[PDB]
C-alpha cells in the first residue's frame, strides 16, 4: 500500500464521517449533514477545509480501536466567503460519537478562533453536540475552557454568530451565551444543560424534550434565542442575508452597499399613523418599514418582549440598528424583559460602529409587584447604561408619548445624542396632565379649570423644545429625509472618553 | 482596503423554480443589462434597467413589453410577483438547495384563525359582534382596555361569528377566548 | 444551600462582584465546591444559560491575580465557570478531598458501560481511579495538592508576587457581556 | 487505600525521581541531582514547586506501564527568590528517562516561561538532557517549538 | 516599587570553615554591629563598623583589638585574609 492510497482512503472516510448508515439516519430525521450545511452557507467553491486528517490520541477505554478512528474527530473546520466577504466557519458533526467534544475537537475550533481574531473576520459556528466525551474524562473539560476563553477574547473584536442545528447539552450550551446572536431551528434544535431524565430524577416535575429546551421555549419565553427558522435550508438562507448586515471586524465602519432607493423621497403615509386620541394604539412597525431602504427590516426576537422592537435595516446603503417602542403591547411600557433585549442589542451595535435610530413612544414603566420583586430597577439601568455609553451616531425621533424617566432611558439628547426630532403629536413631560395637575393643585378648588390651562400650555412638545431638548419639530412625512441627512454627516464622528480598564455595567 | 472582497465568478445560475404544482428547470446567465434565461429548453432574453427599489419594474422579454410588481421577497426563495394583475407565488431555490430540501420533513400545523383570544389582560369595553354577524379580514371584533390604552383585536378570517364568549364589562386575561368564528 | 449549585440569582451576584474587583485591581480568591447547576423548569425558562454565562465571562476576562483553591466538588461545566486555570488563572490548588470530573461516578459509569453486565464491578474500578483529584492534576489542571492547614500560607505567597502582574489584550472599543 | 496515602506515596516518589539507585550513580559521576541544585541556588525555604503530580499521557510502546510513571516527568519547576528577589527556575532531571524531553515536559517549562513574562521576573534554567523522547515521536518536537 | 523584595529572615548562619587541613564548625548570628559567633563551642563577639570597602578593617573580638585585611574573595567561599601579617586561606 502506497502513501497515496492511504491518503485517498482517509479522504473518503473523512467525507463519510460517521458512515453512510449514520448519514442515512441523519436525513431520516430531517437534518442535513455538517458538510451539506456548509456547502449551502458559503459561496460555492470558496470553502477550504483545515486539519481534515487529525484524529484523537486517546487510547483508553478501547478508544485505540480502529473502529473509533474517525478522521476529523467530529468537527468540520475551515474558511470561505459569503458574497465575496471572508468568514470562518466550523460545524459539529453529530454522526461521529454523537457530536461529543474531545480534546482534539476543541483544539480545532480554537485554531479557527485564533485565525479569525488575528485577521479580523467573523466566525459562524453550527452547533450540534451531545456534550462532553466521557471516554477522555477531563480532557474535554479543558476543551470547553479554551473555547470559552477565545469567545470572551473575541467579544467586541469580531462578530460571533452561533446557529444551533440540533440538540446541545452539557458545557456546549454555554458557547451561544458568549456569542452575539443565537439562532435555532424549530422542532430540531434544543438548548439545555441537563435532560428531562435528570429533572425527573432530582425533582418531582414532569417535562419532555421540547418543553425543557425546545426552540419555541427559547424564542418565546426565556429570551435566549434570537430567532428560530422552520428548517435547515431556510435557516441558512436567512443566515446569509443576516451576515450581509455586519462588518467583518469592530475596526471597520458599518458596511455600505449599493442602493437604488432615493435618499430624499418623502413618506406621506406617516402623517396619519399616530392617532390624536391618547388611548388608541398603532403599529410601530408601519413607521419602521416605510423609512428603511426598500422596506426591508430584519426583526430580532419577534415573539419575545413584544413591547420593544429591535432589528437591523439599511438607510441609504448603510447598515443601521433600529430600536423603538410598540404601543400595541402593554401600552408601550418598559419592563424587565424589554430592557434586557434592548440593552444587549444597543451594546452590540455600538461595539461594531453601527448607527442607532430610536423611535420613542413610551408612557412609563410597567407597574406591579411582578416587576418590583423582579428587579425592574436593576434591569432598567441596563438600557439606560447601554445608550449613555454609546459613541456611535444616535438619531432619536419621538412619535408620541415620552413620560417620566423613560424619556431619558430611550436615548434622550442629554445622553450625548446627535439629533432629536419630535413629531407634532409628541408630548414630553414628567407625567400626564392628570397626575401633574392633581399633585400641583393638591387640595385646591377648581382643579379641573386649572387642568384645562395646564393642558393647553404643557400637553404638547413645545415646553421641552424651547429649552433645547428637541432640535426640530418635523412633518412626519419628512422623517426619512432628515435621518438620511444626519447619518451621512455623523458617520465621521469621533469622541474621547476617560480611560478605564473596562466598563462596569450595572448587571 | 483592509479586507479585499472578491466577487464570485458565477457564469451560470442554476435554479429550481416551483410554481403552483410544477417545478421548472431554469438556467440564467448575465450579459449586462440582459439576462439570457433558458426555461425548460426555451430561450428568453429579459432586458431591463433593473432598478430594484421602484414599485414598478419595466422589463422587455423577447421584444414583449411587460410591467411587473414585486410585492414581497424572502430569503428562502419565496417571491410574490404580480403579473398581468394576478399575484403568483414562486419559490426559487438554487440547484443545491432544491436537491437537499427533499430531506426536510413535511410537517403541517393547524390554521386556528377562527379562534380569537385576548392578546393582553384587561377589561372588555366593546364587542362589535353577536353570533351571525359578518366578519371581514382585519375587522375589529373586540376592544380591551388597560394601561390607559385600548388594544383592538381584529379577525384573521372572513365569515360569520359562531359564538361570543366574553361580553363588554367582563374582565379577561392573556390567552382567554373572546370570540369564535365559523 | 441548594447543595452548592449554581442558579440564576447566584450568577448575577457573582458576576457583578467579580467585574468590580477586576476593574479596580483587587485580587480574587475563589473557593470552589460546586456539584453542577440547579436543575428544573424554574431555571430553564428563566434563562439559566444566558445568566450563567455572566459569571464565566466575568472571570474569563479578568486581568487581576486569580488564586483558586478547590475544597471538594467540581463537577461538569461548573469547574470552568468557577475560575478554572484555563481561564488565565495564576494558581490552582486542590485539597486532598477535591474531586474534578465531568460528572460523578454513577452517571459516568452507567453511561460508559451502558447495557453492559457487571456495571457495579466496573464502577468500583472507576471510583478507585477517578474519584480523586489526580487525573486532573497529572494533566496540569492543578498546580499542587496542599494540606488544608497551609492554604493561607500558599495564598499569601502568591498574592505578594502576582501583584506586579501585567497582561495585554486585543484592543476593543468596549466589552460585549452576554447580558 | 485512602487518597491521602496515595498522595504521600506520590510525593515520596517525586522526590526520588528516577529512584535511589539512579541517584547513587548521579553522585558517583560527581553530579548533584536536580533538586539538590535548586536547594543550593535559591534562598533557603523560598522554593515552591509546581505541577509535582503531572505524569505523561503516552500509552504507546509500553509507556502505559507502571514502571514508567515517574511523577514530575523529568523536570523540577517552580519559583523562588535569590537574596529576596523573585526568580523563576526549572531544572532537568537526568535520572528519569535520561532527561529526555516529552510533550508534558515542555509544557511545564512553557508554563514557567509564561508566568515569568507576565510578572517580569528572570528565568534561570539548569539544562541536562539526552534529547527528544523517541517513544512519543513528534510530540517532543512540538515541545521544542513551544519552548523556542 | 514594581517588584517588592523580601529580606530572608536568617537568624543563624551555619558555616563549615576549612583552614589548612581542619574543618571547623561555626555558627554565627547578627545582633546589629556585633556578630555572636560560636567556634567549636567557644563564644566570641566580633564588633565592628564593617565598612567593606576599606583596605583596613578594624574589629574588636572579645575586647581584643585586631586589624585585618581582606585581600581577595571568591563566590565559592575562598577568602584570603591577612591576620597578624600572615595571609591565611580559608574556604
Ligand atoms: C454536567 C455537564 O455539563 S457534562 C454533560 C455530559 N454530556 C454527555 O456526556 C452527553 C449528555 N447525555 C447524552 O449522552 C445524551 O444522549 C445526549 C445529550 C447526547 C442526547 O442524546 P441523543 O441526542 O438522543 O443522541 P443519542 O445519545 O441517542 O446518540 C446515540 C449515539 O451517539 C453517541 N453518544 C451519545 N451520547 C454520548 C456521550 N455522552 N458521549 C459520547 N458519545 C455519545 C453514541 O456513540 C451512540 O452511538 P450509536 O450511533 O450506536 O447510537
Ligand atoms: C537529528 C536531531 O537533532 S535529533 C537527535 C537524536 N539523538 C538522540 O536521540 C539523542 C542522542 N543519542 C543518545 O540518546 C545518547 O545516548 C545521548 C545523547 C542521550 C547521550 O547518552 P548518555 O549521556 O551516555 O546517556 P545514556 O544513553 O547512557 O543513558 C542511559 C539511560 O538513559 C535513557 N536514555 C538514553 N538515551 C535515550 C533517548 N534517546 N531517549 C530516551 N531515553 C534515553 C535510557 O532509559 C537509559 O536507561 P538506563 O538508566 O537503564 O541506562
Ligand atoms: C392609570 O391608572 C395610570 C396608569 C399609568 C400610565 C402608564 S402605566 C406605566 C407607566 N408609569 C406611569 O407613571 N405612567 C405609565
Ligand atoms: C440525583 O438525582 C443527581 C442530582 C444531580 C446532582 C447535582 S444537582 C445539580 C447539578 N447538576 C448535575 O448534573 N449534578 C449536580
Residue numbers in the entry:
A (entry chain J): 33 to 539
B (entry chain I): 547 to 728
C (entry chain L): 361 to 539
D (entry chain H): 33 to 180
E (entry chain G): 547 to 637
Report text from the authors:
Propionyl-CoA carboxylase (PCC) and 3-methylcrotonyl-CoA carboxylase (MCC) are biotin-dependent carboxylases (BDCs) that catalyze the metabolism of odd-chain fatty acids, cholesterol, and specific amino acids. In contrast, PCC and MCC have their BC, CT, and BCCP domains divided into two chains: the α subunits contain the BC and BCCP domains, with an intermediate BC-CT interaction (BT) domain between them, while the β subunits solely consist of the CT domain. In humans, PCC and MCC catalyze the carboxylation of propionyl-CoA and 3-methylcrotonyl-CoA (MC-CoA), respectively. (**A, B**) The side view (left) and top view (right) of human PCC holoenzyme (PCC-apo) (**A**) and MCC holoenzyme (MCC-apo) (**B**). Both holoenzymes are dodecamers consisting of six α subunits and six β subunits.
Using the same batch of purified BDCs ([Fig figs1], H to K), we also determined the cryo-EM structures of human PCC and MCC holoenzymes in the acetyl-CoA-bound state (referred to as PCC-ACO and MCC-ACO) at resolutions of 3.38 Å and 2.85 Å, respectively ([Fig figs2], [Fig figs3], I to L, [Fig figs4], I to L, [Fig figs6] and [Fig figs7], [Table tbls1] and [Table tbls2]). The BC domains of one PCCα subunit in the PCC-ACO structure and three MCCα subunits in the MCC-ACO structure are not resolved. These domains were built into the structures based on the resolved BC domains in other α subunits ([Fig figs8], C and F). The PCC-ACO structure closely resembles the PCC-apo and the PCC-PCO structures. The acetyl-CoA in the PCC-ACO structure has a binding mode similar to the propionyl-CoA in the PCC-PCO structure ([Fig fig3]). The conformation of the acyl-CoA binding pocket in both structures is also highly similar ([Fig fig3]). In addition, the well resolved CoA groups of propionyl-CoA and acetyl-CoA bind at the same position in human PCC holoenzyme ([Fig fig3]). These findings indicate that propionyl-CoA and acetyl-CoA bind to PCC with a similar binding mode. Thus, the selectivity of PCC towards propionyl-CoA and acetyl-CoA is largely determined by the interactions between the acyl group and PCC. The longer acyl group in propionyl-CoA, in comparison to that in acetyl-CoA, may mediate a stronger hydrophobic interaction that stabilizes the α carbon of the acyl group at a proper position to react with the carboxylated biotin.
